[PDB]
């Protein structure tokens, strides 16, 4: 699959710097122009920068001129964004996007990465705690059992949750995080499975909090109640 | 700089309806207009380029039209997987996006399935008790979730979160989490979650006694 994967987003204090990276696979990276685009709920999608395939021509949005620098390492299939003098209004999800190669007079972008979140803040990074939401008689109905994992007390966003290293996706609901009064976030991920096979199947939630490099694998064991 | 304006900002439609999203440019962009589709928490995906060209793998029910300053994205027969926000984008001068049009899907009433989870022994060891009440795959989104502790209605110690509409059945799911200190949790016995919803003839209550699990 044509794929780009952002890395490096996290909590950063106002005035300091942070570098983002983008790993490309599934296409010839050395032959494609590349973009950085960022997203916020209010101001929406905002183009940041573009770089030519050979790393020569570069263009920047006025909002980041003099502070952001785009670069690339074609031998390592990696795109970079150096962000200096960060301000509160720089908080966003940052996307790395491949340039489309459709034959025409003008050009834009086709494939986007999952994004990485940059949170400009004076608050400290905190990794989450993971607790099982064990299936029991109180979480079984009509032959279906519910189970999950509770991910509590982390900062900044986001936490991602997979199940069985990505092999389990049907019936999964990973809820949007809530903001606790302490300023820390918490979320849960749940899944519905047959009650008949709780004794034979293994369900493991894979929690990743990339801002703190916290990775937790928790096997959710059925409860005998 | 070229500004793109979309209309409407939000629309609700049923499966099989024809959906029309409009996008207006502040100045002529010829046919240099792209359409993208984005689902919550996910990356945008390109649907249409050069105002009318369908990208490889995109369903044919998506059609693009227009030139100059007025453009239209048409979904001929809306499907559950079309729940998303759609963005137009001009690439005549740099790249600027519209504010997006959220497409929500109307469907039949579906009652939730209700589950409750006592706090884990691991978390109780740490001094906090989180009790989770789960409502799975219901519609519409409106639901009343009340916590009762020893038959006393609770207030001020719970937080809810709801999912986006599901890409396959267009339902919602919702969690309500009751958080107490370990000391407060051990002062009471019965913990219950009562759910009221249009699809339920009477409220559904799931409960447990502290110590049985």
């Amino acid at each position: 699959q044509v794929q780009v994967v952002e890395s490096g987003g996290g909590a950063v204090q106002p005035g300091r710097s942070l570098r983002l990276s983008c790993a490309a696979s599934g296409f010839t990276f050395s032959n494609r122009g590349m973009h950085w685009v960022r997203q916020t709920p209010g101001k929406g999608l905002e183009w940041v920068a573009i770089i030519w395939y050979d790393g020569g021509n570069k263009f920047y949005a006025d909002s980041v001129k003099g502070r952001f620098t785009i670069s690339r390492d074609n031998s390592k299939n990696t795109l970079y964004l150096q962000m200096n003098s960060l301000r509160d209004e720089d908080t966003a999800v940052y996307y790395c996007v491949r340039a489309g190669d459709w034959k025409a007079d003008k050009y834009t972008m086709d494939v986007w990465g999952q994004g990485t979140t940059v949170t400009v803040s004076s608050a400290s990074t905190k990794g989450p705690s993971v607790f099982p939401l064990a299936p029991s008689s109180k979480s079984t109905s009509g032959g279906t059992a519910a189970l999950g994992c509770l991910v509590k007390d982390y900062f900044p966003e986001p936490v991602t949750v997979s199940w069985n290293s990505g092999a389990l996706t049907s019936g999964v609901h990973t809820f949007p995080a809530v903001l606790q009064s302490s300023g820390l976030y918490s979320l849960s991920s749940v899944v519905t499975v047959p009650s008949s096979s709780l004794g034979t199947q293994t369900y493991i939630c894979n929690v990743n909090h990339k801002p703190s490099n916290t990775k937790v694998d928790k096997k959710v064991e059925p409860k005998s109640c | 700089d070229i500004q793109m304006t979309q209309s409407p900002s939000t629309l609700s439609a049923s499966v099989g309806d024809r959906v029309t999203i409009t996008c207006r440019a502040s100045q002529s962009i010829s046919s240099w207009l792209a359409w993208y589709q984005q689902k919550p928490g996910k990356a945008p995906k390109v649907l249409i380029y050069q105002a009318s060209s369908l990208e490889s793998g995109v369903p044919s029910r998506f059609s693009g039209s227009g030139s100059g300053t007025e453009f239209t994205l048409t979904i001929s027969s809306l499907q559950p997987d079309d729940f998303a926000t759609y963005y137009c984008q001009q690439y005549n001068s740099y790249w600027t996006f519209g504010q997006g049009t959220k497409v929500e899907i109307k469907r039949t009433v579906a009652a939730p399935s209700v589950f409750i989870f006592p706090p884990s022994d691991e978390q109780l060891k740490s001094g906090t008790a989180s009790v989770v009440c789960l409502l799975n795959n219901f519609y519409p989104r409106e639901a009343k979730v009340q916590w009762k502790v020893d038959n006393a209605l609770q207030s001020g110690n719970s937080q809810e979160s709801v999912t986006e509409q599901d890409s396959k059945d267009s339902t919602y799911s919702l969690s309500s989490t009751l958080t107490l200190s370990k000391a407060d949790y051990e002062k009471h016995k019965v913990y219950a979650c009562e759910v009221t919803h249009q699809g339920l003839s009477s409220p559904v209550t799931k409960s447990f006694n502290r110590g049985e699990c």
Partner: peptide
């Protein structure tokens, strides 16, 4: 032109 072809252009 920022909107010109940013990819390899053999022709």
């Amino acid at each position: 032109d920022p909107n010109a072809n940013p990819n390899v252009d053999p022709n």
